[PDB]
Amino acid sequence: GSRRYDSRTTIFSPEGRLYQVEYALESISHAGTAIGIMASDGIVLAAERKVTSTLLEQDTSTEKLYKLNDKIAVAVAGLTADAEILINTARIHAQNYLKTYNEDIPVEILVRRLSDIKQGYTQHGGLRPFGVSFIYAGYDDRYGYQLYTSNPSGNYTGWKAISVGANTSAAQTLLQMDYKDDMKVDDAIELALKTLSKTTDSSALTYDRLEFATIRKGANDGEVYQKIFKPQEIKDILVKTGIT
Amino acid sequence: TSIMAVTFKDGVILGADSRTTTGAYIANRVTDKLTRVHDKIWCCRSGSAADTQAIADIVQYHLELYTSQYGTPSTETAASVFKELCYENKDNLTAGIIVAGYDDKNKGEVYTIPLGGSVHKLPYAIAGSGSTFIYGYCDKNFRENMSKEETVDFIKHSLSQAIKWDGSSGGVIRMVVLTAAGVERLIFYPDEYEQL
Amino acid sequence: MDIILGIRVQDSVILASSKAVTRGISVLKDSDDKTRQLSPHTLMSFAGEAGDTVQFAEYIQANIQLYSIREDYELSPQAVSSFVRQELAKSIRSRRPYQVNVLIGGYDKKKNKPELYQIDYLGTKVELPYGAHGYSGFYTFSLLDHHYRPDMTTEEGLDLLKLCVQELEKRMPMDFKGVIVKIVDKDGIRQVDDF
Amino acid sequence: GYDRHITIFSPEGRLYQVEYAFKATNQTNINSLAVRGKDCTVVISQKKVPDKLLDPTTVSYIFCISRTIGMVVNGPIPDARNAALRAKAEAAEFRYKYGYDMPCDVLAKRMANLSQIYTQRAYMRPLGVILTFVSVDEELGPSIYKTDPAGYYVGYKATATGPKQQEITTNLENHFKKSKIDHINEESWEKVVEFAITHMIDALGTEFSKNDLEVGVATKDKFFTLSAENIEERLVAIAEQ
Amino acid sequence: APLX
Amino acid sequence: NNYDGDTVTFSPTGRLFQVEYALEAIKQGSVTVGLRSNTHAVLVALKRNADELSSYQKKIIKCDEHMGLSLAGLAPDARVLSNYLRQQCNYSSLVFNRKLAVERAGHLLCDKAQKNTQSYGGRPYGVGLLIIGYDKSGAHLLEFQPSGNVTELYGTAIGARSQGAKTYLERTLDTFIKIDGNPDELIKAGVEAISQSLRDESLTVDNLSIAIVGKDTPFTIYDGEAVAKYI
Amino acid sequence: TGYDLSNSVFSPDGRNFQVEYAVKAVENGTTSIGIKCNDGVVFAVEKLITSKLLVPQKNVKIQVVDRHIGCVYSGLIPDGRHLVNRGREEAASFKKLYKTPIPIPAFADRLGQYVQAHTLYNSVRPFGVSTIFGGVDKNGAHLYMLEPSGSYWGYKGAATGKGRQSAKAELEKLVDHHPEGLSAREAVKQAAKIIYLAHEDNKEKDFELEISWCSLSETNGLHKFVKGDLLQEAIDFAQKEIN
Amino acid sequence: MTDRYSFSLTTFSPSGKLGQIDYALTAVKQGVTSLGIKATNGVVIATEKKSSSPLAMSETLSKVSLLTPDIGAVYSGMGPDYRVLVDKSRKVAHTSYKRIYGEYPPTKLLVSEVAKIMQEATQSGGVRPFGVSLLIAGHDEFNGFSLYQVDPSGSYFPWKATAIGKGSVAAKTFLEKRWNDELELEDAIHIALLTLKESVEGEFNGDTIELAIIGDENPDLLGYTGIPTDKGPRFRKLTSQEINDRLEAL
Amino acid sequence: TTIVGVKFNNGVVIAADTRSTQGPIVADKNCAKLHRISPKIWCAGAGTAADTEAVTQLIGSNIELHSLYTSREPRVVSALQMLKQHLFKYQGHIGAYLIVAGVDPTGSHLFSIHAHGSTDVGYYLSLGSGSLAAMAVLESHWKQDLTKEEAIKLASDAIQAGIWNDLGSGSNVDVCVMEIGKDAEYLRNYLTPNVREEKQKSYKFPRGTTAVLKESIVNICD
Amino acid sequence: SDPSSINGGIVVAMTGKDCVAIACDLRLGSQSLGVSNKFEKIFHYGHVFLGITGLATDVTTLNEMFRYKTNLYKLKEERAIEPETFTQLVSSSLYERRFGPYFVGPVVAGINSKSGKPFIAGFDLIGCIDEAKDFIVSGTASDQLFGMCESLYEPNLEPEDLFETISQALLNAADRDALSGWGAVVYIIKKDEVVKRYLKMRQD
Ligand SMILES: [Cl-]
Ligand SMILES: [Cl-]
Ligand SMILES: [Mg+2]
């Protein structure tokens, strides 16, 4: 019968590893680097677009940074199509919670549920896992500013600063070096760009090959604002820090 | 409604009035109640307009699919498909149908299917609300192996009386002739049939 | 079932619920507690169709307790009331709806404010300074309209409540066998034993 | 190499099961041809009856799908009859749902979509058949539309299918270069059938008796197949010219 | 409804 | 070799190896004999034990008052198939007030076994059955194989060394067929038949299992001291 | 390679090896034939007598469908029974909806489409039988033969099994020598002879003859088994011809 | 019976590649060249009509398809896969948008839905990916004109101009030299024809080339008058004659 | 409601009034009862207003997809067949009474559909509460071989009969003309014979008349 | 036991010169018993305003449903939903429950941000869109509101004048209905500012 053609996507190796999860992580390691840095007064999200072409429409484009609700966003590393499936599910989950409790969903609860979906694909169903790693950046009134990551295994962890995708080893060492706890958002913006600039596989870091976003309490009195940076705004912030 | 079908020497003729009723208001005075389900297999519709239309359309579909696989269906076969629909859905249907067709082997045949979904093969059949008033007339005047002209007169005179007494029947008298020669449509207007 | 009352004062919410359980021409019990603790700072009283009331109350209780364990955190009274409303709103278009009316009294620890919510079996939610279900309101509301002030103490609230019970005991046709009174404040939930 | 067993992509982006289904098309070793007249569409196909014990009247690869649509198949008869029954059902359903006769090109597309699903879904194999649909459409006029195991389909001025298809194709190409038109400029369908047989004889280089051929004709409001004597009458007319 |  | 992975695969020579391997499970099973006259039908079965401390595996199962079988091979599969026969016999009685013909019983078993040989995932039944019965057309004996093949016989045997009893019955055919109106003699012939399949072991009191059905005899099984008469 | 390991897989030729392998199982089976006649059809089959212990006349292989169709087959006998059970359901639903008994060509395609469906998926096995069948309907007599692939045609005469070539050769002679037609009673006799002549390819075990027929005049258009005097008469005719 | 293939046929290899997607992209590479160029007041999409036989009527085979009145599509790769995607794309524009909001979807969201369908063929049980890349041009009120590419993986990117298929490498280089942000629609059509001549080998005329535009509203193609707000489709397929007129001044 | 349909020389015309009522109250004094199924197939609807709009949109959507699939202009009989089979399935619970009309490659057509799923053919038809008033006019003035301008006059006159004599109908007359070989022309408010007369007085209040307890700016921005 | 008149309440919407107004009462009751005088029936999603009368549980449920749907709309569309589009969404959502409907009378009001055109619309409980140049009314005093609006309304009123007209329409209508009143709210909506005013009315 059909047994012959089954890859058995949800089994263990002799060493106790999940083949398909490991191979999905290998796929993610070739994807454009995405960095998240958490400051005391906000969060930065920075991500490198995959080898850009000059005829690509840059302003009306979205590859790396997606909005989940008004208080939560994610940076993507991996297959974009897979990520959008998960993103829509996460958006729906957030609205279900708001409908049920009349309160915005706490960040961890959204992350746990999305990670639990990934876990399911590694344990049952016989389907390939989602080739996607997320950096979650969000705010709620319990824990304030929070950074998380999740990977195809469905395992998630919290961070002060973290990278996913390509050159994470080199990127994490650089973040570990210059990061400190009393850091501000504007400093974190500079750290994020400096890290990408040194770890990039390109010749030089430019505005057209980047996506950028911040989550500040920089609105008017006790409320959070999401700023997805425009092309010209990335061009300006790149000059302001002296990279170009 | 007033409807009937009558077998004769050369084949079979179907007959009907053209009245559709919504209460005492005549919703359509020029209705066509004689309906093709196959080239030379037709039916007379009485009861619910919606139910009889929906049934006829399904039968036409079944016989078209039958023809694609097994060739021309018999008149008995067509009547069976009608029966199956009328019998199995008896709780939800108000449909009194007369099925009439012409084979070359079997010549003219008439099958009547009342409310319950039973099947009755007859030399001729009458149905609809107006039929009640012509049971006496039709029984006394029907003969087997009539000519085309005689059968046309028999149906014309019969439906004329049915229309005269039944408020739910009226308009024109439509007829459909089924023979080896082909399919002929006939129409007869009030000014003719009223003064018979 | 029958009489459930609620009063929100300065620093606490007070719920009063009748003790009688009547079936036919017999009072089967005169010490029935028509309430469940949903969380340390949230209390729900209930009245309505026999069986449905307790079944619904305990079902809600289980769900809130499950949430508390999962998140190691207490849901706000507003959040609990919305969850309860949605469950009743689902129920009303079911094959057999829960015929249960509830009051939810809670103390929000983040806001440091008492909160009283009134929800009927249709899923009709309102936040009120004082609330009632059934025929109880037809006497108490007008009485509370007159005597209630928003800055009252818990002791003043209890006296205001005594006035309502006295009016019900005077003009109500049925003997409801007095009330159990419970207070919800910053320190949690406690029962007044002598009322 | 299990990529050659089911319909998934090979490293070079191919579907071998689809390609091998194309080779099953020629397993019967029969050639078919289709041309258009002014008022009609004619399709012809070789008829080979090797076994003496066979009833020749039941051996046929031409099918009457609806009253207006005909279909000839190049490929094994089990798959051919599978396709025929489905086409008949689809054509009948269409008429019931939409209140008018299913056009030839719409039926072709529908059957082509069904074939496409077999190339994408693993559990279903492709049918090893090429389906040529013919009619005189009430909007488009004389029509020839052909379907294959890849799910491809297109309209044709004329077409041919089988082992010696290329020889027949070029023969028809060279005629339409000469005539400078999209069809056979002829009044009667009888002479369009004669044209079809004549050009098949030239391309294949073989003579035909009345039992060596099989003919289908589409006119306005009916498609029909010819009997042996109808073909014999047609063969006599060619010989006497 | 329409009757016949 | 490469064509025995499942029942849905034919070999190049047109064989179904999974069905043949299921047939092999019957050959390993303990011997059981079936034979009939015109008035009665008899089953004899050699029971097998695990060791001296264990019981002897019961081989004969009752299906109705007029029908029953003996088994050789996978006993749980026999339980499934016998249960199906009990239901079919029972359906015939409740709906039609009719005792199920032994021939129809065979046809039903054939069709049930067949479906397990043509679909992916399933497996063939790993048991052979000898069905005896008395219906409106007299005494009957059937042989069931899990390939689906059912055969009506005067006598037969299945299991290990069943060829000996099968040869004996082939010689004795003319004699035992005319044992009419005499149950004990028909059994004696069946006990002598199964004795031709014995090696190193002999028929003891808790080893032998006999069953009989006939004209004025409901299907009944004899075990223990009730078979001491025939040793 | 490995193309032959799974059903519904095309080989590079464009062949389905699993169906061809099912044909080998048919070739291994006993001989069965079908003869079309003036106003009907005749069916016959070889039954190998494996042992003296087989009850004569009581292991019937020819099967009736509805009341006017007969079916015989060679190969895996259970597969044939499964096909006939389906055929009986197909015929019952046809008669239920359309009243008239199912025509033979209509019935042929119902079996054909069902057998063909078992070549479309790897989760099913092809049928290990070639089925000869037919009967009488409104348009007269029809004889059909259906193979594992789902392929079927109409036949003047048909044969399948281990002695198919011998039976075919003998069938071809009847078609040549009788162009106007063969009678029903003659076809029964000829059917016996051909089975006996086809038994030369299976001559270790001796056999038992079984015949059935449908005829407009002789059986009134219904399927019946040939038994008693008419059967013995046909056997004697066959015995005289081999010597 | 029944679909037993409930498992994924596309899986990750040790190196992290998704084989069946890569192989699907290879099939797109073999496919005939198609391109799209975005102008200030419109969008053009074009492709060669590779005829299978000269007896075949290439008019009956449409490589460029209308999805909504303001959105069109073209492809490179496997034609049959494209045809069913157009069917599904047309339907999803109604079921998941028009029947809800009473208006046609914007380009980006319809693209998003097609992308979703193509992603599911990459992960669902018992199916291979689609062997096509799509170029979808369209217009909507709030986003204006736009051009999107959709790959077998389900990934989609917005382009100023691009090409896909056989000679896409050279065709992209050609478009980089010619494209600017001030191009008018007629200028974009001219460049499209120039770019396409490089990849076409045989005959180059209005019968072998298929070309459509997303431009101004066409009231004459609406089919009715009386509703002022309804002004007609922005999608228009250029005729064989209209192409030949522009090939003279080439 | 009053709706009509009239066939003429080279096509068909449909018309309708523009009053919608909840009970004895006029909810909308100028609603549109003429619906587009396809460019050249238009529908006039009476009965339950939500049902007529919903069923015309659903079939209109499916007709568009069908047109794209078949590369053909949609036919009136297809819309008719899809509508009637949908309505019949729901046994009259979808209260949509429709007059369907249009042109297609086959020619010009005019049908009516009742809620239970029965259809009728005719040269002139009327539906709705004012159908009797309309049909009286149609039966009096209709003839064979009408011109375009004659059919529009007859149709609008039939609607007017409903407007004046039926309390369920009122306000204006909408028309749509579908002619063969030409674009269908939708004539919104073709006649407006019920204009409201000038009021005797202005009821513009002095500013400050209404007593106010609280004012506050509402935040609509992010 | 008539779902649309158990709780009571009213909503009215009007158009003016480059502006729109939507207003509602504050009563929520259980038949004769007044229960709440703070029950607002007007909600907004971005710049689009929705008023809902009828069964209060369904009023709350639908608000939560349209908040849900307009939030997902904004995330995917990357822009705020417009009144014309939202009107269609309301209609679709209500008709989805054709044979088990929400017992409501919704009213949409707002200004299109692109064209600047004032827009209002009304629905029955199952989705039938009622578009209007002038005014839309809904609730247990709809007859009274129709009477007030038809007499008081004139076209092209300035925001300050429009406020007086809609306020007087609602107040005097509410005072002839037992199940409506107990306070009132009026929203005046301009292109890029929105003012909310609570009215003083009799409390019986
Ligand atoms: Cl009718
Ligand atoms: Cl399709
Ligand atoms: Mg009052």
Side-chain angles (χ1 to χ4, degrees), chain H residues 68 71 92-94 97-98 103-110 139-140, chain J residues 77:
Chain H
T68 71
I71 299 166
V92 78
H94 283 76
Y97 204 94
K98 201 197 181 210
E103 60 197 56
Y104 292 100
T107 312
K108 66 188 173 179
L109 287 178
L110 179 55
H139 177 274
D140 61 86
Chain J
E77 300 260 1

PDB file of all heavy atoms in Angstrom, chain H residues 68 71 92-94 97-98 103-110 139-140, chain J residues 77:
ATOM      1  N   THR H  68     -10.489  39.111 -11.204  1.00  0.00           N
ATOM      2  CA  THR H  68     -11.572  40.048 -10.890  1.00  0.00           C
ATOM      3  C   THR H  68     -11.558  41.131 -11.970  1.00  0.00           C
ATOM      4  O   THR H  68     -10.634  41.169 -12.782  1.00  0.00           O
ATOM      5  CB  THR H  68     -11.392  40.699  -9.498  1.00  0.00           C
ATOM      6  OG1 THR H  68     -10.299  41.627  -9.527  1.00  0.00           O
ATOM      7  CG2 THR H  68     -11.139  39.645  -8.427  1.00  0.00           C
ATOM      8  N   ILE H  71      -8.199  42.753 -11.527  1.00  0.00           N
ATOM      9  CA  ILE H  71      -7.025  41.897 -11.300  1.00  0.00           C
ATOM     10  C   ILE H  71      -6.880  40.835 -12.386  1.00  0.00           C
ATOM     11  O   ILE H  71      -7.840  40.141 -12.717  1.00  0.00           O
ATOM     12  CB  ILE H  71      -7.085  41.178  -9.933  1.00  0.00           C
ATOM     13  CG1 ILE H  71      -7.120  42.195  -8.789  1.00  0.00           C
ATOM     14  CG2 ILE H  71      -5.883  40.254  -9.759  1.00  0.00           C
ATOM     15  CD1 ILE H  71      -7.519  41.611  -7.452  1.00  0.00           C
ATOM     16  N   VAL H  92     -12.408  31.998  -4.646  1.00  0.00           N
ATOM     17  CA  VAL H  92     -12.027  32.473  -3.311  1.00  0.00           C
ATOM     18  C   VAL H  92     -12.210  33.993  -3.180  1.00  0.00           C
ATOM     19  O   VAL H  92     -12.465  34.497  -2.086  1.00  0.00           O
ATOM     20  CB  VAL H  92     -10.589  32.041  -2.927  1.00  0.00           C
ATOM     21  CG1 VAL H  92      -9.539  32.918  -3.599  1.00  0.00           C
ATOM     22  CG2 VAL H  92     -10.413  32.057  -1.416  1.00  0.00           C
ATOM     23  N   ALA H  93     -12.084  34.709  -4.296  1.00  0.00           N
ATOM     24  CA  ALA H  93     -12.341  36.150  -4.329  1.00  0.00           C
ATOM     25  C   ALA H  93     -13.798  36.465  -3.992  1.00  0.00           C
ATOM     26  O   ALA H  93     -14.097  37.538  -3.467  1.00  0.00           O
ATOM     27  CB  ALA H  93     -11.984  36.723  -5.694  1.00  0.00           C
ATOM     28  N   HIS H  94     -14.696  35.530  -4.303  1.00  0.00           N
ATOM     29  CA  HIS H  94     -16.117  35.668  -3.988  1.00  0.00           C
ATOM     30  C   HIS H  94     -16.447  35.134  -2.595  1.00  0.00           C
ATOM     31  O   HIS H  94     -17.017  35.850  -1.773  1.00  0.00           O
ATOM     32  CB  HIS H  94     -16.976  34.954  -5.042  1.00  0.00           C
ATOM     33  CG  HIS H  94     -17.116  35.715  -6.324  1.00  0.00           C
ATOM     34  ND1 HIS H  94     -16.111  35.783  -7.265  1.00  0.00           N
ATOM     35  CD2 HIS H  94     -18.144  36.442  -6.821  1.00  0.00           C
ATOM     36  CE1 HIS H  94     -16.515  36.518  -8.286  1.00  0.00           C
ATOM     37  NE2 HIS H  94     -17.745  36.930  -8.041  1.00  0.00           N
ATOM     38  N   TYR H  97     -14.497  36.975   0.342  1.00  0.00           N
ATOM     39  CA  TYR H  97     -14.444  38.443   0.306  1.00  0.00           C
ATOM     40  C   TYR H  97     -15.707  39.130  -0.227  1.00  0.00           C
ATOM     41  O   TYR H  97     -16.354  39.871   0.514  1.00  0.00           O
ATOM     42  CB  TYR H  97     -13.213  38.928  -0.470  1.00  0.00           C
ATOM     43  CG  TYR H  97     -12.792  40.321  -0.065  1.00  0.00           C
ATOM     44  CD1 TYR H  97     -11.818  40.519   0.907  1.00  0.00           C
ATOM     45  CD2 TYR H  97     -13.385  41.439  -0.637  1.00  0.00           C
ATOM     46  CE1 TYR H  97     -11.437  41.795   1.287  1.00  0.00           C
ATOM     47  CE2 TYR H  97     -13.015  42.720  -0.262  1.00  0.00           C
ATOM     48  CZ  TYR H  97     -12.038  42.893   0.699  1.00  0.00           C
ATOM     49  OH  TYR H  97     -11.664  44.162   1.072  1.00  0.00           O
ATOM     50  N   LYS H  98     -16.054  38.904  -1.495  1.00  0.00           N
ATOM     51  CA  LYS H  98     -17.165  39.643  -2.118  1.00  0.00           C
ATOM     52  C   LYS H  98     -18.518  39.335  -1.481  1.00  0.00           C
ATOM     53  O   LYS H  98     -19.344  40.233  -1.316  1.00  0.00           O
ATOM     54  CB  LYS H  98     -17.241  39.398  -3.631  1.00  0.00           C
ATOM     55  CG  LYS H  98     -18.016  40.489  -4.359  1.00  0.00           C
ATOM     56  CD  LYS H  98     -18.463  40.080  -5.752  1.00  0.00           C
ATOM     57  CE  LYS H  98     -19.208  41.219  -6.437  1.00  0.00           C
ATOM     58  NZ  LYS H  98     -20.241  40.728  -7.391  1.00  0.00           N
ATOM     59  N   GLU H 103     -17.840  43.846  -2.201  1.00  0.00           N
ATOM     60  CA  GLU H 103     -16.899  44.464  -3.136  1.00  0.00           C
ATOM     61  C   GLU H 103     -15.759  43.487  -3.410  1.00  0.00           C
ATOM     62  O   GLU H 103     -15.566  42.535  -2.657  1.00  0.00           O
ATOM     63  CB  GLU H 103     -16.361  45.784  -2.569  1.00  0.00           C
ATOM     64  CG  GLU H 103     -15.626  45.651  -1.241  1.00  0.00           C
ATOM     65  CD  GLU H 103     -15.463  46.976  -0.511  1.00  0.00           C
ATOM     66  OE1 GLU H 103     -16.484  47.649  -0.247  1.00  0.00           O
ATOM     67  OE2 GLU H 103     -14.312  47.337  -0.185  1.00  0.00           O
ATOM     68  N   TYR H 104     -15.017  43.713  -4.489  1.00  0.00           N
ATOM     69  CA  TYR H 104     -13.911  42.822  -4.849  1.00  0.00           C
ATOM     70  C   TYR H 104     -12.702  43.070  -3.950  1.00  0.00           C
ATOM     71  O   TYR H 104     -12.507  44.187  -3.469  1.00  0.00           O
ATOM     72  CB  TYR H 104     -13.534  42.989  -6.322  1.00  0.00           C
ATOM     73  CG  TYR H 104     -14.603  42.486  -7.264  1.00  0.00           C
ATOM     74  CD1 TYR H 104     -15.481  43.370  -7.884  1.00  0.00           C
ATOM     75  CD2 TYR H 104     -14.741  41.124  -7.526  1.00  0.00           C
ATOM     76  CE1 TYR H 104     -16.466  42.914  -8.744  1.00  0.00           C
ATOM     77  CE2 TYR H 104     -15.721  40.658  -8.386  1.00  0.00           C
ATOM     78  CZ  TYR H 104     -16.581  41.559  -8.992  1.00  0.00           C
ATOM     79  OH  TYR H 104     -17.560  41.114  -9.846  1.00  0.00           O
ATOM     80  N   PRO H 105     -11.889  42.026  -3.712  1.00  0.00           N
ATOM     81  CA  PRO H 105     -10.731  42.170  -2.834  1.00  0.00           C
ATOM     82  C   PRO H 105      -9.622  43.001  -3.459  1.00  0.00           C
ATOM     83  O   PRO H 105      -9.507  43.033  -4.686  1.00  0.00           O
ATOM     84  CB  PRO H 105     -10.251  40.728  -2.647  1.00  0.00           C
ATOM     85  CG  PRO H 105     -10.685  40.027  -3.885  1.00  0.00           C
ATOM     86  CD  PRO H 105     -11.994  40.661  -4.262  1.00  0.00           C
ATOM     87  N   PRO H 106      -8.805  43.669  -2.623  1.00  0.00           N
ATOM     88  CA  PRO H 106      -7.614  44.335  -3.138  1.00  0.00           C
ATOM     89  C   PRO H 106      -6.567  43.313  -3.573  1.00  0.00           C
ATOM     90  O   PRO H 106      -6.569  42.179  -3.089  1.00  0.00           O
ATOM     91  CB  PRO H 106      -7.121  45.157  -1.944  1.00  0.00           C
ATOM     92  CG  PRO H 106      -7.637  44.439  -0.749  1.00  0.00           C
ATOM     93  CD  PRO H 106      -8.944  43.831  -1.164  1.00  0.00           C
ATOM     94  N   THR H 107      -5.686  43.724  -4.480  1.00  0.00           N
ATOM     95  CA  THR H 107      -4.710  42.827  -5.099  1.00  0.00           C
ATOM     96  C   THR H 107      -3.940  41.987  -4.077  1.00  0.00           C
ATOM     97  O   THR H 107      -3.878  40.765  -4.196  1.00  0.00           O
ATOM     98  CB  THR H 107      -3.704  43.623  -5.955  1.00  0.00           C
ATOM     99  OG1 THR H 107      -4.412  44.540  -6.801  1.00  0.00           O
ATOM    100  CG2 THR H 107      -2.860  42.690  -6.818  1.00  0.00           C
ATOM    101  N   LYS H 108      -3.370  42.651  -3.074  1.00  0.00           N
ATOM    102  CA  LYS H 108      -2.519  41.991  -2.074  1.00  0.00           C
ATOM    103  C   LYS H 108      -3.221  40.863  -1.315  1.00  0.00           C
ATOM    104  O   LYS H 108      -2.597  39.853  -0.985  1.00  0.00           O
ATOM    105  CB  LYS H 108      -1.964  43.016  -1.077  1.00  0.00           C
ATOM    106  CG  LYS H 108      -3.014  43.677  -0.194  1.00  0.00           C
ATOM    107  CD  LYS H 108      -2.427  44.819   0.617  1.00  0.00           C
ATOM    108  CE  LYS H 108      -3.514  45.583   1.355  1.00  0.00           C
ATOM    109  NZ  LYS H 108      -2.958  46.689   2.183  1.00  0.00           N
ATOM    110  N   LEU H 109      -4.512  41.037  -1.038  1.00  0.00           N
ATOM    111  CA  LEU H 109      -5.274  40.039  -0.285  1.00  0.00           C
ATOM    112  C   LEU H 109      -5.700  38.855  -1.141  1.00  0.00           C
ATOM    113  O   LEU H 109      -5.732  37.726  -0.654  1.00  0.00           O
ATOM    114  CB  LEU H 109      -6.501  40.667   0.383  1.00  0.00           C
ATOM    115  CG  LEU H 109      -6.216  41.549   1.600  1.00  0.00           C
ATOM    116  CD1 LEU H 109      -7.519  42.126   2.124  1.00  0.00           C
ATOM    117  CD2 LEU H 109      -5.500  40.792   2.711  1.00  0.00           C
ATOM    118  N   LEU H 110      -6.037  39.099  -2.406  1.00  0.00           N
ATOM    119  CA  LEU H 110      -6.337  37.997  -3.315  1.00  0.00           C
ATOM    120  C   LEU H 110      -5.070  37.171  -3.530  1.00  0.00           C
ATOM    121  O   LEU H 110      -5.113  35.942  -3.487  1.00  0.00           O
ATOM    122  CB  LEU H 110      -6.889  38.496  -4.653  1.00  0.00           C
ATOM    123  CG  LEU H 110      -7.207  37.406  -5.688  1.00  0.00           C
ATOM    124  CD1 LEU H 110      -8.155  36.350  -5.133  1.00  0.00           C
ATOM    125  CD2 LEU H 110      -7.786  38.019  -6.953  1.00  0.00           C
ATOM    126  N   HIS H 139      -5.364  46.447  -9.532  1.00  0.00           N
ATOM    127  CA  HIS H 139      -5.616  47.785  -8.999  1.00  0.00           C
ATOM    128  C   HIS H 139      -6.735  47.750  -7.962  1.00  0.00           C
ATOM    129  O   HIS H 139      -7.690  46.980  -8.083  1.00  0.00           O
ATOM    130  CB  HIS H 139      -5.996  48.753 -10.127  1.00  0.00           C
ATOM    131  CG  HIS H 139      -6.332  50.135  -9.654  1.00  0.00           C
ATOM    132  ND1 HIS H 139      -7.594  50.490  -9.226  1.00  0.00           N
ATOM    133  CD2 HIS H 139      -5.572  51.251  -9.544  1.00  0.00           C
ATOM    134  CE1 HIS H 139      -7.596  51.763  -8.872  1.00  0.00           C
ATOM    135  NE2 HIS H 139      -6.381  52.248  -9.055  1.00  0.00           N
ATOM    136  N   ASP H 140      -6.603  48.590  -6.940  1.00  0.00           N
ATOM    137  CA  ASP H 140      -7.679  48.831  -5.984  1.00  0.00           C
ATOM    138  C   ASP H 140      -7.565  50.249  -5.428  1.00  0.00           C
ATOM    139  O   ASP H 140      -6.488  50.848  -5.455  1.00  0.00           O
ATOM    140  CB  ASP H 140      -7.670  47.786  -4.866  1.00  0.00           C
ATOM    141  CG  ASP H 140      -6.387  47.793  -4.067  1.00  0.00           C
ATOM    142  OD1 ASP H 140      -6.290  48.586  -3.107  1.00  0.00           O
ATOM    143  OD2 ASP H 140      -5.484  46.990  -4.386  1.00  0.00           O
TER     144      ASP H 140
ATOM    145  N   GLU J  77      -5.773  44.051   6.069  1.00  0.00           N
ATOM    146  CA  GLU J  77      -5.911  45.123   5.076  1.00  0.00           C
ATOM    147  C   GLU J  77      -4.920  46.267   5.287  1.00  0.00           C
ATOM    148  O   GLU J  77      -4.695  47.062   4.374  1.00  0.00           O
ATOM    149  CB  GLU J  77      -7.327  45.701   5.116  1.00  0.00           C
ATOM    150  CG  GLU J  77      -8.437  44.697   4.823  1.00  0.00           C
ATOM    151  CD  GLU J  77      -8.971  44.764   3.402  1.00  0.00           C
ATOM    152  OE1 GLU J  77      -8.480  45.581   2.594  1.00  0.00           O
ATOM    153  OE2 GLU J  77      -9.896  43.984   3.095  1.00  0.00           O
TER     154      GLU J  77
END
